[PDB]
């Protein structure tokens, strides 16, 4: 046995292209549309729950995931690669930050750590790159609200708003017209639902849409009282009912 693949499977071609990264981006392109919009008092991330079968319970499959109490993530591309990345992202947020500084990492640094893991799969021996693009929305005290995109290469860029996957080109154009620097969170959620309707073919409701926000602190979701400084998570996943309420005012 032994992992005898100690050499890179991603290499530079004569043209200067890293083939496997490009192909990973192709896989991301085939994936279902997800998006992110940053407001003045919050961030929203959204995607379509593309159910593989109607017998499958799509509530069990979570495309939008909590990484830290103030950071959330959504993807486009290969779900299994996303699932393991979320596990690693949650863990690294503790090991390389919380267990040292006694607090959760700021969005940009957690993004940096995720990006590092994705880069290493692009250079290390005997592995292919991750076939996902992430959109990480988050809040921290000194940087405020932020939204980042992370690609298979490990490159990451901060966005005011963006989209990735299937209908990204059309969706980014739609967002460019609607976005401004004076949006409230509810206005961003409204735009997110409008933008996401264009890429969805079939049913468009709270059961076929996944949507979460990084907004105000939720002391009801904290689980305990008695420490004034601990005010609860800013991440909140919107319920199926909460989405449908806003679809009536759409």
């Amino acid at each position: 046995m032994t992992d005898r693949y100690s050499f890179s499977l991603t290499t530079f071609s004569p043209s200067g292209k890293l083939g496997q990264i490009d192909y990973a981006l192709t896989a991301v392109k085939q994936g279902v549309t997800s998006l992110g919009i940053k407001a003045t008092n919050g961030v929203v991330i959204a995607t379509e729950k593309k159910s593989s079968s109607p017998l499958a319970m799509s509530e069990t499959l979570s495309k939008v995931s909590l990484l830290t109490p103030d950071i959330g993530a959504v993807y486009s591309g290969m779900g299994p690669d996303y699932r393991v990345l979320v596990d690693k992202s949650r863990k690294v947020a503790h090991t390389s930050y919380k267990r040292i500084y006694g607090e959760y990492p700021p969005t940009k640094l957690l993004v940096s750590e995720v990006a590092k893991i994705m880069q290493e799969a692009t250079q290390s021996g005997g592995v292919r790159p991750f076939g996902v693009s992430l959109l990480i929305a988050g809040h921290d005290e000194f940087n405020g609200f932020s939204l980042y995109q992370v690609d298979p290469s490990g490159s990451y860029f901060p966005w005011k708003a963006t989209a990735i996957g299937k209908g990204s080109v059309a969706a980014k154009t739609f967002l460019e017209k609607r976005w401004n620097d004076e949006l409230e969170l509810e206005d961003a959620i409204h735009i997110a639902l409008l933008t996401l309707k264009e890429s969805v073919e079939g049913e468009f409701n709270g059961d076929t849409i996944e949507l979460a926000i990084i907004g105000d602190e939720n002391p009801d979701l904290l689980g305990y009282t008695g420490i004034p400084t601990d005010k609860g998570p800013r991440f909140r996943k919107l319920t199926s009912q909460e989405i449908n309420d806003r679809l009536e005012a759409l």
Binding site: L18, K108, S112, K116, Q119, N143, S146, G154, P158, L175
Partner: peptide
């Protein structure tokens, strides 16, 4: 729609006296 003020793809700080300008894969550079 790129948030330019919080963005850094080219110019990085190594210490108080030395800095670098990057050309190529940003992820590799970091």
């Amino acid at each position: 729609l790129l948030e330019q003020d919080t963005s850094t793809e080219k110019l990085y700080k190594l210490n108080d006296k030395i800095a670098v300008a990057v050309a190529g894969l940003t992820a590799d550079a970091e």
